[PDB]
Structures are given as C-alpha cells and as structure tokens.
Amino acid sequence: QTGGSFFEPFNSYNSGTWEKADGYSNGGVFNCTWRANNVNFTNDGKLKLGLTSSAYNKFDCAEYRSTNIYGYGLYEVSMKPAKNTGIVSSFFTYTGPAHGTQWDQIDIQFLGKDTTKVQFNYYTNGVGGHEKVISLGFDASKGFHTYAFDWQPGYIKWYVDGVLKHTATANIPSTPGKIMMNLWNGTGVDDWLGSYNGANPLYAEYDWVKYTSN
Ligand SMILES: OC[C@H]1O[C@@H](O[C@H]2[C@H](O)[C@@H](O)[C@H](O[C@H]3[C@H](O)[C@@H](O)[C@H](O[C@@H]4[C@@H](O)[C@H](O)O[C@H](CO)[C@H]4O)O[C@@H]3CO)O[C@@H]2CO)[C@H](O)[C@@H](O)[C@@H]1O
Ligand SMILES: [Ca+2]
Ligand SMILES: [Zn+2]
Ligand SMILES: [Zn+2]
C-alpha cells in the first residue's frame, strides 16, 4: 500500500526511502542528465540538488524520489529554490506511464527566471492545464520558507507559510505517486522559463519534507 505519514530531515542519503535518479535524461524539455553525484546533503542537514557542467553546453541535474508511493494527505516542504533564467526547482507528486499508471501529478515549481513567484499545477490522466502563478511577497531563493499542498478527493489547496494561496476543485487526481524534488534546465521552452544561459553550478536546497495521510 501507499506509504504512511512521515518526516524527512535530509540528514543523509537513505537508499531505503529515497532514490537518486542517475544515468539518463527525461528528454524533451529537460536539457540535462540526472546524476546521483548531483544529489548531496550538507553538513547542516539540507538536501542540496545541483545543476552542474563538465562539458560544453552539457548539463547534469538532479532528482530525488521517494521509493514509496503516497496518496491523499498534506504535503509540506521547507525549501530554497535556485535563481537563474531558464531553470526549475520543484517539489511534486508524480506517477505515469514509466511507472505503469496513468499520468497523475501535483506540482510546485519555482521558475528560476523569477523566484518572487511560484507555479502550481496538476495533471489527471495526463490532462493538465491547471497552471496558476502566485506572487509570493518575497524572493524564495533568498531563504527557506514552507510550501504545501493538501491533496483531497474534491480539492487541492496550496499554502505558503500556512497561508492559503490557491484552491483547485476540478478533476483532482487520485492515483498515488512518488514524492519528488528536482532541479533542471529547460530547452525549447524559452517563453515559459526564459532561455538557460549555462550558469553553473546552481543549487536548490530542501530542509525537510513532511507528509500527513488522511
Ligand atoms: O523505472 C522505470 C523506467 O523509467 C525511467 O525514468 C522515468 C521515471 O521513472 C519517471 O518518473 C519520469 O517521469 C517524468 C516525466 O516524464 C515528466 O513529464 C515529469 O515532469 C514533471 C512535470 O510534469 C511537472 O510539471 O514538474 C516537474 C518538476 O519540474 C516535472 O519533473 O517529470 C517526471 C519525473 O522526472 O521519466 C523518466 C524517464 O522516462 C528510467 O529512465 C528508465 O531507465 C526506467 O527503467
Ligand atoms: Ca533538515
Ligand atoms: Zn516565510
Ligand atoms: Zn486561485
């Protein structure tokens, strides 16, 4: 069954509860290869995802994924996304074809082109289009703040430091998924992310993640 409530402080790599994407690229808009070497833990207990390069116009990025799958409940994360044109730092639930299910996800994405805003979205059976951009009232890249989504049968509610910022009720996903965090540079989506200018290294940091089931 779907995993139970938990609290992850990111003190170290726990290959029992989390996995590091490694040796492949998502392709498409993801113009980088996931590297386990890019998922690291600081001395002070922060997950630190890195976007790096060791070759011309060639980038290595990072994705950390839960081994367990999770359903309806409250998802919270304290993080500090990267700031730079053409990148994304994220916290999200995901399942899809590569997992042997329909595409259901709920996502928080910080577009590096403007870290004073955040984007919320979700997909149900591969149908998305629920994008919402929210002004934060601060630059997220400058400190750790707490972001969350409460995923329930008839709604998703997103919060920033406990303040309700947006509510969705239409066609809410139901297929349990992995909790994931990633940092990556885009290609072919300059209008959305800005073009990426190869700045490296860049990092997204996460202090903890908490999930509370129904
Ligand atoms: O293990 C099985 C097999 O699959 C492989 O990797 C898969 C991986 O399992 C899977 O999670 C992955 O899913 C990605 C989607 O393709 C991509 O669309 C999705 O993008 C989301 C956005 O939709 C969302 O808005 O924002 C977030 C954050 O910015 C974004 O990530 O992201 C997911 C997760 O990365 O695709 C992989 C490749 O198909 C392995 O490659 C293969 O070797 C394994 O055998
Ligand atoms: Ca921590
Ligand atoms: Zn705050
Ligand atoms: Zn709204």
DSSP of 73-126, one letter per residue? Answer: EEEEEEEE----TTEEEEEEEEE-GGGTS--EEEEEEEETT-TTEEEEEEEBTT
User: What is the domain-level CATH number for residue 144?
Assistant: 2.60.120.200
Q: What is the DSSP letter of 17?
A: T
Strands (E), the chain: 6-8, 18-20, 33-34, 39-41, 47-55, 58-66, 73-80, 87-95, 104-111, 117-123, 132-135, 145-152, 155-160, 163-168, 178-185, 202-213
Q: Taking Cα atoms as reference points, which of 69, 2, 65, 70 lies closest to residue 206?
A: 65
Give per-residue burial for 116-151: e unless 16+ CB within 10 Å, then b.
eebbbbbbbeeeeebeeeeebeeebbeeebbbbbbb
Pocket of ligand 1 contains residue 33 by CB under 6 Å: no
- Interval between CA 132 and ligand 3 midpoint (Å): 20
Chain centre distance of CA 84: 16
Q: State the Cα angle at 10 between 7 and 14, rounded to 5°.
A: 90
b/e map 175-194, b = 16+ CB within 10 Å? bbbbbbbbbbbbbeeeeebb
Token pair in block for residue 75: 């998802």
CB contact at 8 A, 31 and 59: yes
Alpha carbon distance 44, 38 (integer Å): 17
183 lines ligand 1 (CB under 6 A): no
Starting from the CA of residue 126, give the closest ligand.
1
| Domains in the chain, number | 1
Name the resolution in angstroms. 1.6
Q: How was it solved? A: X-ray
How far apart CA 122 and CA 128 sit, in angstroms, is 6
Is residue 9 within a helix (H) or strand (E), and if so which, with residue range? none
How far is Cα 66 from Cα 199, in angstroms, rounded to an integer? 29
Domain that holds residue 95: 1-214
Cα four-point dihedral sign 54, 55, 57, 61: negative
Return d(Cα 126, Cα 136) in angstroms, integer: 28
Q: Is residue 185 in contact with ligand 1, taking CB distance under 6 Å? A: no
Neighbour count for residue 113 (Cβ, 10 Å): 18
Q: In a 3-state reduction of DSSP, which class is residue 8?
A: strand
Which positions ≥6 away from 163 have C-beta within 8 Å?
none
**Strand 117-123 relative to strand 132-135, pairing:** antiparallel
